[PDB]
Design a protein around this ligand. Sequence first.
Ligand SMILES: [Ca+2]
Ligand code: NA
Ligand code: NA
Lengths: 159, 158, 161, 161, 158
Amino acid sequence: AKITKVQVGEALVGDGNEVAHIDLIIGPRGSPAETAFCNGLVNNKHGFTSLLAVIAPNLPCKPNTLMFNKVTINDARQAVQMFGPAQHGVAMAVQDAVAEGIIPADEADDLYVLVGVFIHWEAADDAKIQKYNYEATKLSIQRAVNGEPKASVVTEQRK
Amino acid sequence: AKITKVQVGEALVGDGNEVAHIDLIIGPRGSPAETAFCNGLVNNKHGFTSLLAVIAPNLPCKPNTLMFNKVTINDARQAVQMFGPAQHGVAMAVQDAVAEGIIPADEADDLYVLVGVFIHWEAADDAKIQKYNYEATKLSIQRAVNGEPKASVVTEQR
Amino acid sequence: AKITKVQVGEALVGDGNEVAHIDLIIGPRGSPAETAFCNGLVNNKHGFTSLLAVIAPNLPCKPNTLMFNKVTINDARQAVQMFGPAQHGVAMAVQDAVAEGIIPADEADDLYVLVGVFIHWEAADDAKIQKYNYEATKLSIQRAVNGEPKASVVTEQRKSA
Amino acid sequence: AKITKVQVGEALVGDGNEVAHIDLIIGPRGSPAETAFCNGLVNNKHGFTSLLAVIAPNLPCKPNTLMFNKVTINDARQAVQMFGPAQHGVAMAVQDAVAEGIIPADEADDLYVLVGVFIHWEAADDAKIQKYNYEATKLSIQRAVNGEPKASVVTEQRKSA
Amino acid sequence: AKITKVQVGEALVGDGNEVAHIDLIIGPRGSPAETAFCNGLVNNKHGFTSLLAVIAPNLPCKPNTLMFNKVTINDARQAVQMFGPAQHGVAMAVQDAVAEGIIPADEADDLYVLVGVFIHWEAADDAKIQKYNYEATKLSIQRAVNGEPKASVVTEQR
Ligand SMILES: [Ca+2]
Ligand code: NA
Ligand code: NA
């Protein structure tokens, strides 16, 4: 609950070739999350795309979510995994976070989410790609919104 | 004014290989839509271009519109589609949105529209490319200007 | 006219293979025109360059002008067309716009001009490349500073006057 | 706070093919380090990646750190090097700087670190790769935070090699 | 202070294959020079690098300087010219500008310099690469810091 500035979250969930790694940023209007969202939607290159995540055709998740790949997409199969299972899991995770109140419903129309997904070339099981990305995204959102892991917590784990 | 902050719209219209998916951003002077517009016109890479959309030679649509592709343009054919039917449909959608009261005419000279078009490699029918991008762009503008869909609506419909 | 905010202009001028299409943005210090100018000079890639336009060696045009290609530069022939005739045409147009008062002389040191140049692979006549890019840039500057075409005008002619 | 503006640090540490060269920027929320962090995480290309540095799985270092390679990653081994020892050395350095108070712990949740890593393709000793990046990062962080070297100091030494 | 806003400089110095062309931006904290410096350090790609210029190992010139290439670096020989003689010339130019009073010593820790270099791949004499880049860089800093050429001056020479 309550997001008044940029927050970063990250998670690794799953196993095998479909394991899902997610880097995430969320922030309000007027912040760098908003400018990076706009620039990120406009700037694409060979192998590296970005899209406005939707949970169903003509139904984008809210808050506005820009999803982009961190592992290069070199053929139709990798693209399909990105736009099908992975997009669906990320989008569902964002909307469920609003449904559950992790992202407050009254801020949801004024926030931006940036989601970097890592889908291995070896991934093949769509049901797992979808599920693991859904879980890694939901986890990254809760960690980002609650500011975790806290500095001191991580500090006292290196010494 | 009606459009006082950055808004994002999206739509998927059509069928077959010419189906049009549009990602759209609209915003006023002083907003990130303006900065994204300037950076986007300046930064291009092989296969990924951007241009100031026009209705006809020497007749840009207003509000100022930056159209850019989201599917790599690998050959001349795709490029002719981008610059021909797709650009015409996008530009017509923007001007028609002003005409239909979707974008207030008194704000037109002070807004920026960013339109990401997705033209499949298999797309081949020019008339459909134009028509569907026109329809998906206009619907994306309509939605963005009104903040649609609202989070509660998506949450509910989820 | 006086330039206190970001203005956008464009023009298509000429015929044959050397036809020039210019997309242009002009703006003051503190505006996104300035930030895109700085990032644009810094960020280059294979086949896509940007340069600080000059009218002569060691003599850039003012206001500061960042020119960048829209068509991939695949060989020396195209790099020379970009750096030779197109650059000279663009730079001359900016400077002439200042000499003519279109860009006021008392603002020229505080503006930034971003110019996207589209040179078709078929272009071959250098005098025409230079001429048409000079004209299209001059025309784009005039349209940008005067805010032309006004939305009301384009709306009335969207179907054609 | 102690780190109230953007600071830049750099360091070259180690020997051999594992020698580590680190370019580093650190700064608070609202500064260009935050904007460059968000953009840098979002914008990747063939051979040039960026990642949120972690000391362990599901355990990112704090302050938030964006690590990116300066040498094109063309094969799988360069990637393992980048993601394995390099990342680990960098991430440890950042946490240790917080532990030692170089980066105050009461602001570690409000700063961003940008770390550019250079790894020659001839590097092979994961053990060195990791220690040199750890040391180069740690040095780069204290140099940035303390504003070293001062301009006056560099000016004095600009001639004596 | 003397450098209180973003300034742009350029110069062409030398002859043969080692001729040096420099495009340059300099500016204070809080200016777009600072933001372009940070973005430019982060964003690199195949053939196009950026680095924090140093006079010697562990000795960066000050003001903080981001040097980047404008000509594609395709092989190890071009990379060595970039990181070796060109970098040394650029870094010495920045430090000498401070020593010669071109950049105020008391502003040196608060400025950012962005230097774009154009090394022809045919360039072969390292001493000339270093000398011409040093000369073009110092001249570009001198021009930028003083706003030269002034528009009236270029207009008169045109
Ligand atoms: Ca880029
Ligand atoms: Na409407
Ligand atoms: Na001087």
